Design a protein around this ligand. Structure first.
Ligand SMILES: Nc1nc2c(ncn2[C@@H]2O[C@H](COP(=O)(O)OP(=O)(O)OP(=O)(O)O)[C@@H](O)[C@H]2O)c(=O)[nH]1
Ligand SMILES: Nc1nc2c(ncn2[C@@H]2O[C@H](COP(=O)(O)OP(=O)(O)OP(=O)(O)O)[C@@H](O)[C@H]2O)c(=O)[nH]1
Ligand SMILES: Nc1nc2c(ncn2[C@@H]2O[C@H](COP(=O)(O)OP(=O)(O)O)[C@@H](O)[C@H]2O)c(=O)[nH]1
Ligand SMILES: Nc1nc2c(ncn2[C@@H]2O[C@H](COP(=O)(O)OP(=O)(O)O)[C@@H](O)[C@H]2O)c(=O)[nH]1
Ligand SMILES: [Mg+2]
Ligand SMILES: [Mg+2]
Lengths: 430, 439, 52, 431, 430
């Protein structure tokens, strides 16, 4: 019961998803051929959440892969774990969005979604009791941000009471691969705040720093960055698939983290992370995990958490540990840093404990925090947008496919409205 | 001949219930599968277990309890454990969607489809019983389904049975350490329901139990498993007079006639002594005089409340072991000579003492060391006004700007019940301050 | 995993005093009686009915 | 049914209580484990009902070094594990640290434990407290403990076995500072005080036991023997028994003058203790010999007020009386005019016990003498001189100031010592 | 409990620490791999004073290695006992100071000190009950004398109540290896007098004198001087780490040695020290130990202790010995040398006994003395400084990096003020 479905779109989303399924299958003991090879009963206890059951006893993930070109979806099938997914769930076009949000949301993306909504509707209908959706996509691309945000709107219309997760990779100025990133990123934020219940933002800038310094490996690639995100993604739903002292599903996280409906943008991080040469000098204890958890350099976002005030924060502990240690550590950090925690809400940290740690680790921690420091990212993105739009540069592509400059101004006002509304509580006092 | 029915709702109540049922089976010699050991099947002629269990007609015994929760993880975990063969299969009611710390979810949306099934189970259990004394309900207040379903049950049971006594062993949030962030909201809402529908309430916060394990038991890293073992001993001590011969027996009905002066005032906090580990248990005598002095020690209060800040009203303290009626009288008279412990003026005599012959039992492989004597205390004092006042302050800070409200309004909750719940806590405060005033 | 065994866990418990979840403190006494058994208390000698 | 609680605070108190308790356990026949191999013990030990016993003592310190020795030595089994109170940071010779900064965070638990012990006790005679005056925590916590006890229990007798600095031999350098403050603290809070400075015992060891390199272990044995001889009347049968309360009946003429110094005899090494009979007349003169005083003080420089001598062994009462007449007839030993009768005697039948590995030789007779005399003013005068030289240019004052002590406390203690010396001088004159 | 964290900076500081940690490891029975191999039970009771936690049955020191150039630490990591230190604690720049106090304290020191402060904060938060800090550095160099004292200032700012030790190797005119030594030396003394709680000066000239005359060894190298310094440093906390007749931690030394707040500069020495050829002829007894202890040539400084009067002195005895003998020897020395001990401080010698002797000896003593004879060390430094400063020689290097004549004038004024106020008590009498 209370199972969830997975949808991934674009190149960035597909690469994130292709590694997330690798991580999950390892925990539950599923080989790439879909045959169980585990050792404990708890691995097969709650497999209904992420997997379907087919004749012959093979498990298949309930995931939908969407894109507008077969370039990336041909590689994912030709590589490892390509036989895990159902061949009929692969849906894709033939042209490609061409890094144009208007093309991926108005002209070409709207034409394709008739097919993909059918398989999603079929998947969400055959389940016993749906819990929610989760989306992986990038806000800096055409098909990822274009079709991805449109798919959220229509699914929301059919499932008003279900919850939605989005693991979004927003583009930072320091690492830029497209020249029209500020345009389509801003347009994606407009529709995202309206429909998505929970939004987690990821930065390629921050992931590089973590891999450069904490893991101390000189040559990262997109393979390693996708793995860092994958570990956190499985951590959020860890307590949904394993027993624990304190149980908290996705809905419980939403209630305890969102004070007001429009403020649902979070930052995430993982612990422990140690280099190969320094892994035998560390001792795995709760007091040392909480130090790396709250480290400002460990967050997966370019925003500095010490530049604002934490509205609320959550920690998901995995492994064997005592609740007295966990509870007393979350109290101390709040008292020592009362300046960085907003003061009209007492004890704004929620703790959950799961009894099964990840693969090969005695203990692990996933941190999800809602802080006012996230405003800086939108401010610097909007600054790039207003310089480009004041000259109407590259705007003949969007105006040439049915959308007008009225929408561009309207979207900018809402995004600027969010920051002003979000920063209000940073200086608000009781 | 005499029965009591225990109701467990919410994760906090269920996990406490698991510890309690481990102790009861061991206290009566019943194996986890429900069958008595083959070596002494016919040895236990006396039916002292009839208070909690019921003979199946041929062989095993079934507990008189039902398990309730909307989330399936905790309940189905029991069904896969070694206790799968003890409980009746269809008295473990399970749902599909959790309340998710939302009181409105567990009282209007999901809670109304399960309360129908439970009352059917309670009806069948009550008809088997013939001398029912009362109900025992365990639930954590700071939770969604714990406060939601518990409110619905007590309201439903109050009209379905009427004059039957009900006891609530609730767990209120700690003064400073907490698990959730929005529990001050639904704690007040829970307080509204159990005020006019529960005969006796017990304060069992978590900070006090942490300190007891750290100081007396000498455990630096305690967990929930250790906490629930201590609470089980309190439940066993309170009901030990219903199933064992003693010098001064006490019934379940022999509480509200002696501990409740006024109908509104029925909240109380518990205390237990001695709590000691085997490493230093045999250094001291554990005499009657010193075990009863530790009961009044503020550090051994099971709730983080300071009795020195208020006056005592009544104390029901139960002795189990080889205590002598002469010994308790000397110990009690010594207390009255003490000046720090001050009772209210309009209560000249304020001690209800019970004596039992069965010494307390300890689970093998556990923490505690078995001792000849133990005393459990239930005290009604005016100092409990602090725990409600600090909850009132926490709620007023967040509700002043309507924080987290939209999660409740969208689940069938009207805006106005937040205000009226606040007033009744304020009304409760005035009752406590006007009752301890000098005349 | 590269995890420490009991022969190192006891040494670290003696050195820094870090404990596992819900682990008692062992002071390594020497017992004449069995700690698992025995009721651990002083009992006043109770005679039979003396009033007769 | 008579008991007495002993408090050991500071390193000196702990390291003398170790010897005291090994001696008591050996004397009563209880193994270090606390078990008795198959009623007099009831004064010091409490029965647990099945097997072992527990001493009526509590250990205190802020430095966990000495306590960890006891919890790991051969006496780990004897003591209750939560009455070995240990801190985390030492006072480090700073009196204000042991009275104003970290002394207020540990004294509460000590009072709790003492209350628990006193509730169990039923015939509490009084308190024994052992401390090192010239130290930080010893003078600090001891002061706080006496201040709390004097209001908590009231009229219960408290006896302080203090150890003042020696005239010329000492270890610390700010030690004269905090001795005066502790003197103020204990003057109005201790009913009977005994002076047991280190230098005098060193002389006694070298002169009698013929050991040229003694250590603290040898010294603490003598103090334990003195304590045992003092308290043996509470737990053994004798011809004349003296309680604790018959010391606050016979030795303190006025409420202020309650300081005294002790002596012990015979103390002879085994290689030469058997060539002499050591009759009662010999031991009674060695006790009055000025070189045998346990404090570096000259009794010939002042009068005598009261003298209490405790005989243990096979002594005969008439033999003691003849010794009293001889002492009175001697001209060098002179008593004050307003005290015609000046001796209180006690006789006990228990011969002294011998600890294996010690230096003392077992003898049939032994006398412990406690004397109150005007000669004790010279130690106060010399510590006053040292303090005045120290305080002239305000050395080491900022260390105490930065811990919460007011400036005028030193002056108050100085005038207190001046008043005490004036009281001794005015009482020493004739009528 | 009452544990201390160690910080070493610069070439000289790193060289001192590399020997000090070897000595401590040998004393505590720690192999070069960090695994306990001791024989006695006492050797493990108080190891948490200096060593942290690690998985695998090993221990790791709590030391931080800091320098602006990676030359020396890359050498010490490959040397003996170089695998103990955590690689995370190795912090280095890439430029170096080049014997410039301004460069190592204003331009490059501020840039790098953030990481060292962060790691120090990590260690201090981790440790159970901090007792204090101890530093080993040289005052005649650029990176050491500047960045170490900047660290001292910040650590004193953050922990105003803890204790602090510094072991300074000040430049001596007899053996000079740099032409710009006086400038940074006086600049560092000006900062150190305000912040340090216990400072212990060392001279290379005195060490060479000792190894040439007492040890009678032909060719001393930096190894032997480092060994002497390490033994002297370990003798200070021997009684803190091990049981003894009289236990005395760092705090007890300060309150017994510092009469007035700004007089906290000591000179140290060690006994016994004998040549290899004369080892079997000497008799090791208490009187001989104290005789060599008070021998003038045994001090570790160029200042003659017979040219001034001792304020206070403290000796820490190691081994099993009678307490009466120590006291009578101290009294005998203080009586026979009453001319060299200032009169208004009666019984101005302190004694402490620890019953665990050093590995190799049956008896050993560490001497620490606060004498009015340390001023000649300051007097000779100031004479060179004023001679070079009159002509403004070599001043452009310092003044080109944010510095000017004002702080030089201020420091020389503070330098002379300490000398005058420190000499006044030599002539002050009762
Ligand atoms: N003493 C004790 N308290 C518990 C235990 N488990 C949970 N709690 C308390 O219960 C509070 C939250 O409610 P939970 O018991 O976790 O869950 P619930 O009451 O069933 O409500 P839901 O979360 O909606 O399912 C926490 O703040 C804890 O203080 C337990 O095992 N022992
Ligand atoms: N007779 C005797 N005296 C001792 C012994 N140990 C210490 N002292 C005395 O104690 C004085 C110094 O104070 P300490 O007791 O050592 O230290 P403290 O009183 O515990 O105060 P802190 O050092 O701050 O803990 C010395 O002058 C000694 O005379 C001992 O074993 N026997
Ligand atoms: N983490 C991660 N980021 C990626 C990957 N591939 C591309 N990106 C980022 O995504 C941005 C471009 O998005 P894109 O893939 O073109 O979106 P799409 O056109 O909708 O598929 C670039 O700035 C990259 O930094 C990947 O495999 N992993
Ligand atoms: N005792 C000792 N002194 C040293 C050692 N190495 C260098 N020195 C002294 O340190 C001085 C040079 O200081 P330097 O290392 O350049 O200081 P830095 O520039 O701050 O690192 C020289 O005068 C040497 O006498 C050593 O291994 N041991
Ligand atoms: Mg639950
Ligand atoms: Mg001490």
């Amino acid at each position: 019961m209370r199972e969830i479905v997975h949808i991934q779109g674009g190149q960035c989303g597909n690469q994130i998803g292709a590694k997330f399924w690798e991580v999950i299958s390892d925990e539950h003991g599923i080989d790439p051929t879909g045959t169980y090879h585990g050792d404990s009963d708890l691995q097969l206890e709650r497999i209904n959440v992420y997997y379907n059951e087919a004749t012959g006893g093979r498990y298949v993930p309930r995931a939908i892969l969407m894109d507008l070109e077969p370039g990336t979806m041909d590689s994912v099938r030709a590589g490892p774990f390509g036989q895990l997914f159902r061949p009929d769930n692969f849906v894709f076009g033939q042209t490609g969005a061409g890094n144009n949000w208007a093309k991926g949301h108005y002209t070409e993306g709207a034409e394709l979604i008739d097919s993909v909504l059918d398989v999603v509707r079929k998947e969400a209908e055959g389940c016993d009791c749906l819990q929610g959706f989760q989306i992986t996509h990038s806000l800096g691309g055409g098909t990822g941000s274009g079709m991805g945000t449109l798919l959220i709107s229509k699914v929301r219309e059919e499932y008003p009471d279900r919850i939605m997760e989005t693991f979004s990779v927003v583009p930072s100025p320091k690492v830029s691969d497209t020249v029209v990133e500020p345009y389509n990123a801003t347009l994606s934020v407009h529709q995202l705040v309206e429909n998505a219940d929970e939004c987690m933002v990821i930065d390629n800038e921050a992931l590089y720093d973590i891999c450069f310094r904490t893991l101390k490996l000189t040559t990262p690639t997109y393979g390693d960055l996708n793995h860092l995100v994958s570990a956190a993604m499985s951590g959020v739903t860890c307590c949904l698939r394993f027993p624990g002292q304190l149980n908290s599903d996705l809905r419980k996280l939403a209630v305890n983290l969102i004070p007001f409906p429009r403020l649902h943008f979070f930052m995430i991080g993982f612990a422990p992370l140690t280099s190969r040469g320094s892994q035998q000098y560390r001792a795995l204890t709760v007091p040392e995990l909480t130090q790396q958890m709250f480290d400002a350099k460990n967050m997966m976002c370019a925003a500095d958490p010490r530049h604002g005030r934490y509205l609320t924060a959550s920690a998901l502990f995995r492994g064997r540990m005592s609740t007295k240690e966990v509870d007393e550590q979350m109290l101390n950090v709040q008292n020592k840093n009362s300046s960085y925690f907003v003061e009209w809400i007492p004890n704004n940290i929620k703790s959950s404990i799961c009894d099964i740690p990840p693969k090969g680790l005695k203990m692990a921690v996933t941190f999800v925090g809602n802080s006012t420091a996230i405003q800086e990212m939108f401010k610097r993105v909007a600054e790039q947008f207003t310089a480009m739009f004041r000259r109407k540069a590259f705007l003949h592509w969007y105006t040439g496919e049915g959308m007008d400059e009225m929408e561009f101004t309207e979207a900018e006002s809402n995004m600027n409205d969010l920051v002003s509304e979000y920063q209000q509580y940073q200086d608000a006092t009781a | 001949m005499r029965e009591v029915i225990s109701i467990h709702v919410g994760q906090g109540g269920i996990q406490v219930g698991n510890a309690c049922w481990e102790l009861f089976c061991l206290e009566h010699g019943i194996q986890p599968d429900g069958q008595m050991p083959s070596d002494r099947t016919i040895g236990g002629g006396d039916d002292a277990f009839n208070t909690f269990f019921s003979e199946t007609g041929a062989g095993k015994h079934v507990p008189r309890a039902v398990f309730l929760d909307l989330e399936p993880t905790v309940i189905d975990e029991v069904r896969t454990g070694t206790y799968r063969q003890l409980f009746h299969p269809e008295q473990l009611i399970s749902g599909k969607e959790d309340a998710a710390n939302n009181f409105a979810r567990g009282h209007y949306t999901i809670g109304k489809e399960i309360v129908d099934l439970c009352l059917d189970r309670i009806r069948k259990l009550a008809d088997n019983c013939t001398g029912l004394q009362g109900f025992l309900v365990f639930n954590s207040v700071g939770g969604g389904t714990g406060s939601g379903l518990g409110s619905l049950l007590l309201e439903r049971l109050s009209v379905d049975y009427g004059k039957k006594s009900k006891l609530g062993f609730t767990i209120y949030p700690s003064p400073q350490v907490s698990t959730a962030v929005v529990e001050p909201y639904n704690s007040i809402l829970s307080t509204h329901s159990l005020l006019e529908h529960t005969d006796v309430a017990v304060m069992l916060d978590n900070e006090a139990i942490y300190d007891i394990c750290r100081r007396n038991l000498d455990i630096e890293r305690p967990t929930y498993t250790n906490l629930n073992r201590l609470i089980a001993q309190v439940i066993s001590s309170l009901t030990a007079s219903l199933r064992f011969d003693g010098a001064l027996n006490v019934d379940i009905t022999e509480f509200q006639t002696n501990l409740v002066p006024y109908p509104r005032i029925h909240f109380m906090l518990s205390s237990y002594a001695p709590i000691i580990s085997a490493e230093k248990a045999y250094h001291e005598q554990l005499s009657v005089a010193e075990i009863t002095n530790s009961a009044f020690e503020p550090a051994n209060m099971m709730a983080k409340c300071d009795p020195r800040h208020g006056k005592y009203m009544a104390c029901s303290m139960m002795y189990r072991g080889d205590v002598v009626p002469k010994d308790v009288n000397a110990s009690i008279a010594t207390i009255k000579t003490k000046r720090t412990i001050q009772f209210v003026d309009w209560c000249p005599t304020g001690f209800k003492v019970g004596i039992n012959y069965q010494p307390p039992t300890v689970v093998p492989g556990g923490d505690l060391a078995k001792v000849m004597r133990a005393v459990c205390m239930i005290s009604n004092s005016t100092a409990i006004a602090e725990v409600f006042s600090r909850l009132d302050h926490k709620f007023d800070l967040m509700y002043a700007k309507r924080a987290f409200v939209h999660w409740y309004v969208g689940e069938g909750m009207e805006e106005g019940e937040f205000s009226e719940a606040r007033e009744d806590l304020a009304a409760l405060e005035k009752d406590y301050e006007e009752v301890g005033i000098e005349t | 995993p590269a995890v420490n065994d009991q022969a190192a866990h006891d040494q670290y418990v003696r050195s820094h005093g870090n404990y596992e979840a819900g682990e008692q403190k062992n002071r390594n006494y020497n017992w004449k009686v069995d700690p698992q058994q025995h009721r651990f208390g002083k009992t006043d000698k109770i005679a039979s009915n003396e009033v007769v």
